[PDB]
Amino acid sequence: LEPIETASRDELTALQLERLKWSLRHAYDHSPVYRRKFDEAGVHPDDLKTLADLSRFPFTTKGDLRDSYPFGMFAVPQDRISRIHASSGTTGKPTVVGYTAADIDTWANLVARSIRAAGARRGDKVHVSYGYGLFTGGLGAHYGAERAGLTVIPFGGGQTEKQVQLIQDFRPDIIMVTPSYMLSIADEIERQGLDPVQSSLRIGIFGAEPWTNDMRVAIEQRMGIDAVDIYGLSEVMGPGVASECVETKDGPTIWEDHFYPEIIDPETGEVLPDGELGELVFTSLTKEALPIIRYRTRDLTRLLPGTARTMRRMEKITGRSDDMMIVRGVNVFPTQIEEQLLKQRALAPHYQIVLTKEGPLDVLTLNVEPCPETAPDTAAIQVAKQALAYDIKSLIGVTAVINVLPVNGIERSVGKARRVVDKRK
């Protein structure tokens, strides 16, 4: 481990304060957007005397980045930008980010830290299935595994049959991949009559989208691995903003020596005490090219005390604020549905939620599949469909039309699964 990972909280705090002061000054001096934002908010970098003072400073939102496209957020000259990446476009036009060579180095060290936290060992191979390209996931995973001194197998997305061929042949110890795509790889392993538990894989590091504890336990049992959660977003850096320690599996530990977290009430912008659910906000402490100050992530979670590290954790992401569905008056996230689906051993872990209107009433249709083994077993499927409907009603408050499709009926994820098709318009 790095010394900082077990430093005292006093030591960490002091380090954060020094770096936050630097970052605020760097943004104000070198990022025209932040000179304007700070002036129009009536604050100066000098106003930060303690970490609690961060709440004086304005927020940065997606809109700020969209307005400055492509390169208006940068705080260094274009000749110092070593790398361009973009967000994935999930909510709209991708936003563009940049990195100096030092920022690439920092990112590589943080992803390496996250891979260590997952339980990596000298001699491990890493099979990277996160997409390579303008997306931050693939190249971020790549550089971090390479920095960790491991054997990098840079496969990227797609070609499921080939990925399974190479998992057999190359015997990777670690896979870095979305949890939804992991399911497709697991299916393919089983489709070929192989036993996925006996795969060489020891560790899965899954991120890029929400996945429940229930999902983790299912995947762990099916693949014979430890699975840990890695979090990031492109505005802040990419994967490796936070990652779970495999010895606790209690939500990603935030690398807050580099990215300082807050939680706010999304409606008011007020800061909440640790433990309360709301919107996750980050400020970069060491970023050169694109310092980012109080970025409202639109990801919903809560901050929790350090366990396996000095650094605090986040709870597993509940969802994006954009993920929230309002169904006949009840607010529901896809993860809530997923938790109930994963109780049914007779059903696959694949799903899609389709929202419609029938007259004036909302209708939520949950499309599921049997496991391939259970498909012919009508009695098992029938119990599953009824128990799932009863769990969603009793625990979530929504009446879900459960619709069991043939095996392979649901379009498989290519990366970030689309959990929801809202046809209500």
Place this chain on the structure above:
Amino acid sequence: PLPLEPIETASRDELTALQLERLKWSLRHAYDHSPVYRRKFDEAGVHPDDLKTLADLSRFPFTTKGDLRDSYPFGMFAVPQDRISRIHASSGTTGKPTVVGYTAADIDTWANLVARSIRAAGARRGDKVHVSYGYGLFTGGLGAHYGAERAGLTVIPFGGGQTEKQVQLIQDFRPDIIMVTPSYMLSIADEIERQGLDPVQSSLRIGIFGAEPWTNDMRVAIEQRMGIDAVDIYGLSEVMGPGVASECVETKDGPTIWEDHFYPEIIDPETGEVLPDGELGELVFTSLTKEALPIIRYRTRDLTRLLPGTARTMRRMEKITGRSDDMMIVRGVNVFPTQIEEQLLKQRALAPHYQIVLTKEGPLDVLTLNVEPCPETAPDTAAIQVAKQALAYDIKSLIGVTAVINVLPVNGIERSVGKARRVVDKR
């Protein structure tokens, strides 16, 4: 200009001496640590210390594709697993992909040689590089990426596909250099023109095109269309990846081989005899500095000739004529797709897109050349008729081959995303 390394123009005497020392090391490393080379050298009755000068290299046995295939996945490796930093693979063009590995030192060298290649293309401080080569197990994309990043440039790691979006980002990000296959460049150019833009007025100044053969005539065509300088970069996964050799933009006289790291020979592919420089034959490489996968006298199956250094001390290769695998035998006459390309490009009424289809009709090899009009000339039936006839005549009179010229509609030929499939052999 971005700086030359001193070795790039140091004396040939100094270069020879350092090649010899590195070759002695590489042969020992292979023999001592690669269990395949221990077997190969022992069976040929040679030992590393048989190499006294560079002229002795042709005493050593060849390595072929089959050697690699027989060693899948990791049988060629010459360092322990925990020193392997990276796995890549060949593209599968001719069969099952062959797997290669790299230590950290290897990855560093590769990044240095791709940077050297990008500098040779005329890159400048502050340039943005749009990388359109595929990212993944293929060596191209990550090889280009690391090299552009090592040169200190601004890397835009797009990768393959999504042509409309690549064009949007060529507009929005205004890159200076694009690294891409010549056949996929053609698609990008089409899409620029389709979105109503003048491709000459693109921000791009330099195209660095490899991964497949493309003629000097194709070069001049793309240069005029895009308003760029276009240079050729060569590589193959067994040897390293892209950056084995790269053209100097000031001479455009075929890729200069980085023979401080990869020592080239040319052989008669039938006999294995080494040919004097200047004669066409099969290219053969020996790595001088590689750790994880030393490769000794690898028979590339690429056909070319060696030429004296011009812009560098290092020798050049001619632009690749083709793979051995590309050669068609058509009614007793040997013909390469690049020869067909040269004639196609004389026709201003026809696009630069093509694909050859080989069938048999009784005794006859039928070579059908699928072409398209230019967008502007598609409705001009007379111009297209003359282009067809003139192209058939050129192929017959200059190559000795009867071809059927099949004019498809615009977009009738499946577009390349990387290495175009030039020949579909249905015989």
